[PDB]
Curated annotation (Swiss-Prot), chain A:
Gene name of the encoded protein: Rps27a
Functional description taken from the UniProt entry: Exists either covalently attached to another protein, or free (unanchored). When covalently bound, it is conjugated to target proteins via an isopeptide bond either as a monomer (monoubiquitin), a polymer linked via different Lys residues of the ubiquitin (polyubiquitin chains) or a linear polymer linked via the initiator Met of the ubiquitin (linear polyubiquitin chains).
UniProt domain Ubiquitin-like: residue ranges: 1-73
Annotated site location: Essential for function: 68
Site feature location: Interacts with activating enzyme: 54, 72
Top-level lineage group: Eukaryota
Protein name: Ubiquitin
Crosslinked residue numbers (Glycyl lysine isopeptide (Lys-Gly) (interchain with G-Cter in ubiquitin)): 6, 11, 27, 29, 33, 48, 63
Residues that bear Phosphoserine: 65
From-to range in the entire protein, with total length: 1 to 73 of 156
PTMs per UniProt: Phosphorylated at Ser-65 by PINK1 during mitophagy. Phosphorylated ubiquitin specifically binds and activates parkin (PRKN), triggering mitophagy. Phosphorylation does not affect E1-mediated E2 charging of ubiquitin but affects discharging of E2 enzymes to form polyubiquitin chains. It also affects deubiquitination by deubiquitinase enzymes such as USP30. Mono-ADP-ribosylated at the C-terminus by PARP9, a component of the PPAR9-DTX3L complex. ADP-ribosylation requires processing by E1 and E2 enzymes and prevents ubiquitin conjugation to substrates such as histones.
Curated annotation (Swiss-Prot), chain B:
Chain's role: Ubiquitin-binding protein. Specifically recognizes and binds 'Lys-63'-linked ubiquitin. Plays a central role in the BRCA1-A complex by specifically binding 'Lys-63'-linked ubiquitinated histones H2A and H2AX at DNA lesions sites, leading to target the BRCA1-BARD1 heterodimer to sites of DNA damage at double-strand breaks (DSBs). The BRCA1-A complex also possesses deubiquitinase activity that specifically removes 'Lys-63'-linked ubiquitin on histones H2A and H2AX. Also weakly binds monoubiquitin but with much less affinity than 'Lys-63'-linked ubiquitin.
Assembly and binders: Component of the ARISC complex, at least composed of UIMC1/RAP80, ABRAXAS1, BRCC3/BRCC36, BABAM2 and BABAM1/NBA1. Component of the BRCA1-A complex, at least composed of the BRCA1, BARD1, UIMC1/RAP80, ABRAXAS1, BRCC3/BRCC36, BABAM2 and BABAM1/NBA1. In the BRCA1-A complex, interacts directly with ABRAXAS1. Interacts with ESR1. Interacts with UBE2I. Interacts with NR6A1. Interacts with TSP57. Interacts with TRAIP.
Localization per record: Nucleus
Full-sequence portion shown in this chain: 80 to 120 of 727
Crosslinked positions (Glycyl lysine isopeptide (Lys-Gly) (interchain with G-Cter in SUMO2)): 15
Family: Belongs to the RAP80 family.
Domain UIM: 5-24, 29-45
UniProt name for this protein: BRCA1-A complex subunit RAP80
Annotated region (UIM-linker), positions in chain: 22-28
Description of post-translational modifications: Sumoylated. Phosphorylated upon DNA damage by ATM or ATR.
Free-text comment about domains: The tandem UIM domains form a continuous 60 Angstrom-long alpha-helix and mediate binding to 'Lys-63'-linked ubiquitins. UIM1 and UIM2 bind to the proximal and distal ubiquitin moieties and recognize an 'Ile-44'-centered hydrophobic patch. Since UIMs don't interact with the 'Lys-63' isopeptide bond the UIM-linker region between the 2 UIM domains determines the selectivity for 'Lys-63'-linkage, and its length is very important for specificity. The Abraxas-interacting region (AIR) mediates the interaction with ABRAXAS1.
Length: 73, 45, 76
């Protein structure tokens, strides 16, 4: 499945995932691709920040869905 | 040193994400409404 | 045999088809008269949404039947 992650500069990252992937998995992918530690990643979707222990399925994040990535310290 | 605003861009992401979700839902909803209307037509006449 | 396709906008379209025609093919024929992309079409017959893989005879859609059309953004 393909999803997107929009960053602050407007630069968009595309990820190939599975509906059973957890948010921590997604943060793992973003780290592997962008070099950003999961500790500094805040992922927002549908008006809220997503939690590490849940799946994309739990948030009804479908194909082509766009996730917003904002950074922490 | 630090100059940007974390909770500010955090708030923006929440809002844009919010809007985006409302858009997706509205789409799914109209598509369901159209489906319901076609089913009613096909059974009522 | 001919069948009719109805839109919610009140338009009635006619189609020449064979019992052996598949729903995929029916949508193709609609596309050729209305321009509507086949994957945006949803056909409803007697309360049932028709699947692309079956044929008209699978649904016992006989001559003179009326199908109801409504759209979706895309398939999948």
């Amino acid at each position: 499945m393909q999803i997107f992650v929009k960053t602050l500069t407007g630069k968009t990252i595309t990820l190939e995932v599975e509906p059973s992937d957890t948010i921590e998995n997604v943060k793992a992918k973003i780290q592997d691709k962008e070099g950003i530690p999961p500790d500094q990643q805040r992922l927002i979707f549908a008006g809220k920040q997503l939690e590490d222990g849940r799946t994309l399925s739990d948030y009804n994040i479908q194909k082509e869905s766009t996730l917003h990535l904002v950074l922490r310290l | 040193g630090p100059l940007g605003s974390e909770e500010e861009q955090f708030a923006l992401a929440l809002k844009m994400s919010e809007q985006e979700a409302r858009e997706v839902n509205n789409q799914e909803e109209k598509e369901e409404e159209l489906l319901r209307k076609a089913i009613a037509e096909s059974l009522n006449s």
